[PDB]
Symmetry: D2
Subunit: 333 residues, 4 copies
């Protein structure tokens, strides 16, 4: 994990959808995963302590350690959520606070999705855990994360494990990328309210008449780079000005169009080490249907996994593998 | 038409691909159109003169007037091309210059793809015509246009009907959006050479340590808006830096990722007249395969049409309709 | 007041200097004021408590209300400070927290310059005060303010009356404009670390060589408008790269070159109400010499006042009136 | 030279004024020079044809080579001009075109100010010349230049020795910096018409109010760096919107304020060669008064030279040296 952009939206259909890109430096073995009720998810990768999960859920994630790790997903009661990179800000403890258990940052999404309904449930659950510096997701240090959640009702929150403790932001705008903290970007929005769909008025310099080249000059000032702050502003503004989605499909379509302003093609961003950082997949999920939708760097065709289609009291993890090949429809031979 | 961005690329296995977005306010009757050889293409809509085309070609276009109007396409000899808005700059004439025939701007692609092989053929071809200020029932007036072509060998040209006459640009960088002129954008590139994939180095102010938020800071300065100038910069720069495609399928994919930085969602851009200006479709062509690929605002799955698959001596236009339904694959019952 | 930019610097001379532009819609009655020892400063306009001041100071201010109101200044012990706008963020009590005295935001600088020596004294003094929502008759309301101070040693702090109470920021980078809060701008700096004095290297796009138009391209990404946030970046970044000053005089000069990046011409910024927001004056002060220097919108020649040349036990304010006529040295008859 | 910004303005007092910064790496020997009538100006350093100047002028320049080289200046008939850097564009001949006299690029201002009145006079003058690729000794080589002139009527033209020959632009907006060519910057202007003094309206995102930080948001998008294109934008836009000067003195004041957005502190721009590039002097001249005004990097106090005060039929050049000392006025000691 190395960067990502997310947002949620509300349809006129009365549905809530959430979506996110994921950026990274290669493809990992990642599938969409359906975790059945009562499966058991650890808190710490170093202790064999299991929490029985009341709920089933589906999302993108890894099976590379003991309990499924979910980057995002939706559960059978309509809770949607994700974890996103939060570098230089994320701060964790060595020891739990008296009265809490240790949890690995990498397990937050799975635990919550499996045991919560509303955004208030999330806030409540969280006060019974301390995020811990557990080394060895055999992928190293606990990655610097922060979290967003959105429930069936359309409310979004952000949880950020800062130096000064856990920060909750309630009733947010339903946008989140990477560092810095949420209130920093919310404040940043203010510097860019002049970014609109509407063209500016022609002007004169002496005798000279000045008019735009074409269209789209309203957005002058919007940065087009892929830093977390730039991405934050493109998702928010294009969330603001994109037409309301009138049903679930349109919602998926509109989410992927907005995220398209923050999709990273392979080669245009390199890391301090010269690894390439690119959008591996984009996904979306609907609280009311509990459908998971996703598309990949190598596959523009959207796939869909339906949570309630499966037997939720299954003993076993149900799994779908990525199809990393451009799914082109041939209209003739 | 109302805006669009385009580029070409080269693969590792020596294939040339060209791609474009089409931005518009309505989205009208448009389809893929295969024009066969010897179909006959009008020069002017108010006149009965028809040039008989030597080559078959496929591209997106309209069948609403006498001859197919192609917005872009590839022909059987591997020439690719496209017309794109050129507002404020496109200048035409009332009457043909001595020794040329008039041509309607919306017929250029069709005429060229129908009769040329190399970009040099295109340049020579063009000195026997004069763009005329005609007009069409569709939009109600001659649209301000400029044109781009790329042949099998990956060489690109831009043709621009300027106030002073027709301006040719030879061996271009293979990127073109809208106004202004090609020389203006080529010159503009230089103000932006500091936009790279590489992070800037940490610095200090007094006792502060300052380091980037995440990744991507090497891009500081690139603009994010949907003006033609900004779109050019984004397509040019991201063309430079994203990976070389290893084959044809990767070409289409990469082209669409790059164009993605200039895809316009419904509502983010409005005209003076309050109309929403958004990307209706996105297409890519391949000189060697002569395949035509496309996706739409409501359908992200790519479709393909093979020109060489059809009877190239057909009497009748062959067409493929837009499938404006988001084509979701269900991996279980949805 | 309606905007302003400020910074401090240290010479290789072991001197500290502070300087600020002042941006406002019209020029009230302002001059440079020397407040002598034991003069007396009110805390509040509606209450009659007058706090006796231990120290003399000089700076820019108004004499329109009961006690001299200073916008910035330096005192006889080398404490330097200023009040600047903090719109939408400043928050005041109706009523003092138990066991503090109420203080009008507009008296904070005069109270502090009068009774403090170090950065720590300022912090301590402030916990004995509570900022109240008391209006004044120059403006009609309590203007939203924040404050910066710099002592003889060169430490700088920012003090910000936030919703949740007074926020203190210790040993800052020595720059401060307007809203938002200090942490936010400090964080904002990280997004621009790639803004440097050095040019980026040429690149090629295919056959094309791309080189800068001239000099200065290292700064690509720096915004040029006059919002508080853009002014912070320019002053901070140009404070970083500007040559160290070798003595007091060069320190004044450097301060005003840097501040020139954020000097606002009449007409270029207008308020929601159409009043023009422009840089009325620019000042500087040195902690070691206790000299105050200023120039005006209408007069770029620098004037200087020396606190310690006066009698610090004078009965009365000593004041120097602005000279609003461009002070042009005639080199021959004009 | 390695940069200059320049503009002209018109007061409501019916006076025309012209101003320019000059940016360089170290200050060579320059002063204000008054060139009297009939003093004579060389065309080329390597040939002794001297052209007799009808008119007296005053400008900043150098006395290091045979004839005075002025960098800018105004003449006794109200014609004002400057030569600015034109790197990578300026093209000069090896040989004078059939029926022209060769001229050293560095002598254009001096020759033009010495014999022209209107911008038309200057267009006709220059087409009797060919700019020649002849080296000079204060800088070592032939510097790539272009030229701006403004006559007493307030019309401006820009002359640029392009690849394809001398390009001429009639009645320009009265702004000029460095490369690229005039028509490129004029076209660039259209991209930035939404740059105004006015704040954008407040907006909302969901339940959140968004309002500007303070003032000045109207200018969002304007670049702040010191390249020539950015320098052009700022000078033009700030020239459009800063208030009309009511007289000659305000004209000067306003000119230097607009020019201050393009003033370069020592250290914020370094060349490839690690040399620091900075604003050495800022000057202004008035067509009606024939006054010349200047301030320096080290002295923001403005100085003035009046052309007509002198004997315009003097035997010798009259000059004034720079005072690179901050001229502080002591209000008490």
């Amino acid at each position: 994990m190395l960067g990502s952009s997310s947002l949620s939206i509300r349809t006129t259909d009365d549905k809530s959808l959430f979506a996110r890109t994921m950026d990274f430096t290669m493809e990992p073995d990642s599938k969409v995963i359906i975790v059945p009720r009562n499966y058991g998810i650890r808190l710490l990768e170093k202790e064999n302590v299991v929490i029985n999960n009341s709920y089933a859920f589906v999302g993108m994630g890894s099976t590379d350690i003991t309990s499924p790790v979910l980057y995002d997903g939706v559960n059978e009661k309509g809770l949607m959520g994700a974890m996103l990179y939060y570098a230089t800000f994320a701060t964790y403890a060595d020891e739990p606070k008296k009265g809490t258990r240790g949890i690995n940052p990498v397990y937050v999404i799975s635990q919550v999705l499996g045991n919560c309904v509303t955004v208030d449930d999330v806030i409540e659950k969280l006060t019974s855990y301390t995020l811990l510096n557990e080394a060895n997701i055999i992928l190293g240090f606990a990655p610097p994360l922060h979290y967003t959640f959105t429930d069936a009702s359309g409310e979004s929150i952000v949880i950020e494990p800062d130096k000064t403790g856990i920060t909750i932001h309630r009733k947010t705008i339903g946008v989140m990328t990477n560092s810095p903290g949420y209130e920093w970007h919310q404040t940043n929005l203010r510097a860019y309210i002049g970014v609109t769909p509407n063209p500016p008025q022609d002007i004169m310099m002496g005798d000279l008449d000045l008019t735009p080249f074409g269209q789209g000059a309203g957005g002058l000032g919007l940065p087009g780079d892929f830093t977390p702050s730039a991405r934050f502003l493109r998702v928010a503004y294009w969330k603001k000005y994109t037409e309301k989605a009138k049903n679930e499909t349109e919602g998926v379509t509109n989410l992927f169009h907005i995220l398209s302003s923050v999709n990273i093609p392979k080669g245009v961003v390199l890391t301090n080490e010269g690894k390439t950082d690119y959008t591996i997949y984009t996904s979306a999920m609907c609280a009311q249907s509990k459908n998971y939708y996703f598309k990949l760097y190598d596959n523009s065709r959207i796939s869909a996994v339906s949570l309630m289609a499966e037997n939720l009291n299954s003993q076993d993890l149900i799994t779908f593998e990525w199809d990393r090949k451009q799914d082109i429809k041939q209209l003739n031979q």
